[PDB]
Amino acid sequence: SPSAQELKEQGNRLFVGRKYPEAAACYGRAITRNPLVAVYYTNRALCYLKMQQPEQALADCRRALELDGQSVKAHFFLGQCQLEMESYDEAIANLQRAYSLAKEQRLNFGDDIPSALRIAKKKRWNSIEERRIHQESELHSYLTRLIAAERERELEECQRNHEGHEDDGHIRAQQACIEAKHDKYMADMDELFSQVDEKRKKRDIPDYLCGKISFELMREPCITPSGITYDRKDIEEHLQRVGHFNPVTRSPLTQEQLIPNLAMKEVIDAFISENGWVEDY
């Protein structure tokens, strides 16, 4: 009896009311009523995501796009899902694409995309990073076991030394007691092989090295009278595609007022020149 346009509104009220499983089911009746409407699917897709079930959302997006391959939201959400499924490559791609469309269609979300985009780039890198081998070392592999050895000679050759004088309760603490003595002795070591000119140290890219708009590494940093540093290429268009105001302080800014942050370029250059990765990031 209720119209699809009414069922959507209903779900809209629920979703705002955080009743995600209920709103989603509400969009489902509006879809059976009229499949040919992209909004429904993308909306329901957002319910599934909030309901932590990319399985469904992924499918529902793969339908909203069949009725609108130019859907910014559909692409954004689709990419989102892929993140959960851990398809880091595709995910960042659809976000990338969902970003261009949004820019193209002259839509405005701000951060919402470059942010999640930058986030998906970070969560991706995190993967192949913990996937590296680092390759122990000649002296390492050696001393590494020398300790594990000295440990057995105690826990398994000095613990049962007094099965009576030290029952379960006693040496159960006398066990981890020495274990920590060795887990640390070695701990100090690890830091040695890491600070010893070794690249085995976690490789990540700072934040103060990215733009306040692009949310990515800057190649032509320049600051404003306010003091915020953006990439000359991003606040370039924002000045001729959104207005004449600082995208942060919202101050009356104008293109011929941008100062080149030379000291920054330096810092950014030096970074790259030292970090092999990146470009792969």
Partner: peptide, 9 residues
């Protein structure tokens, strides 16, 4: 006063 994406319109 823009508009976010994590919103069902």
């Amino acid at each position: 006063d823009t508009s976010r994406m994590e919103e069902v319109d």
